[PDB]
Design a protein around this ligand. Sequence first.
Ligand SMILES: CC(=O)N[C@H]1[C@@H](OP(=O)(O)OP(=O)(O)OC[C@H]2O[C@@H](n3ccc(=O)[nH]c3=O)[C@H](O)[C@@H]2O)O[C@H](CO)[C@@H](O)[C@@H]1O
Ligand SMILES: [Mn+2]
Ligand SMILES: [Mn+2]
Length: 309
Amino acid sequence: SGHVSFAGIDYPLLPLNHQTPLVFQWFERNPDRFGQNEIPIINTQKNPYLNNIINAAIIEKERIIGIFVDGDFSKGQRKALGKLEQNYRNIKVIYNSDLNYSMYDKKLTTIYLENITKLEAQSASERDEVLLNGVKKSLEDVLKNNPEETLISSHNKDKGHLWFDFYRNLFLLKGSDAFLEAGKPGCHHLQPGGGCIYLDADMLLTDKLGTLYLPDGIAIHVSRKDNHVSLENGIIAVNRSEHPALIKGLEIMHSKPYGDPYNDWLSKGLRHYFDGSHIQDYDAFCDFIEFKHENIIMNTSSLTASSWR
Ligand SMILES: CC(=O)N[C@H]1[C@@H](OP(=O)(O)OP(=O)(O)OC[C@H]2O[C@@H](n3ccc(=O)[nH]c3=O)[C@H](O)[C@@H]2O)O[C@H](CO)[C@@H](O)[C@@H]1O
Ligand SMILES: [Mn+2]
Ligand SMILES: [Mn+2]
């Protein structure tokens, strides 16, 4: 087929051709745990993530493979990453410090003040007074510690998995263009305003992916463990920059206090985008949105060990 229907609307199954880059991510909170000439990406027996990435680059020879990294890497470590790119010409190491996300950002005071106003406009007998008090306390904390804290500055390395989860969604907003904005060479055959296929480093390719067809050009991982189905992070495929489903999620992150990249940006953003009146089941949405591929063994860490839990 060439279209699918969901919540009463028809959506074309849009192509992500074999150009569309794959993107892995490695945000490293403690790069001093690697040798100062070692590639600072986990590569243990239980988490063989650099090998998995290399193995994907070998399989997907004709396609760019981005590694989206962050952390306080040594010069020697950056040179080891440069050497990886020499050894596998399709790998492009993108430093999160080389991208500008200011167009997506918002001050935490602003979010808190907007939520306080809205709550105080509601009657005392109507409103969520516990929330109102929680938000006023978050505001006090920010004003005391760092008044200029923003959504983005707040999702830093000190926040565990929130650091990489938040920045992953930001990178997906940029899409293919992030390769160009970070000054990566040999990325000029990427489509301008193009998309990418984000994969967790334990999503093992066993053979080429080829051309993908996704509804409205978007799809996400679903777990089926079991008998059980949920949206999951860990595969995010888009055919274009600023996918409106992801923009919708960002609007939720800008209006909610305590917005979560998984629960709010990704899950509610997508579901509110494709099924805003909530007329169809969640399991049906999972089926509609599911990234399916027979040449990926998905989430292999859950059969071994989590790299951060
Ligand atoms: C549910 C699922 O199928 N995958 C998610 C799961 O990972 P899970 O719990 O499955 O953990 P994994 O070991 O697969 O690591 C997932 C990914 O997180 C990133 N990573 C991990 C550790 C680290 O120090 N630095 C780093 O950047 C990497 O991109 C890695 O690929 O929870 C993570 C944290 O909410 C999400 O990010 C993953 O998308
Ligand atoms: Mn089903
Ligand atoms: Mn995993």
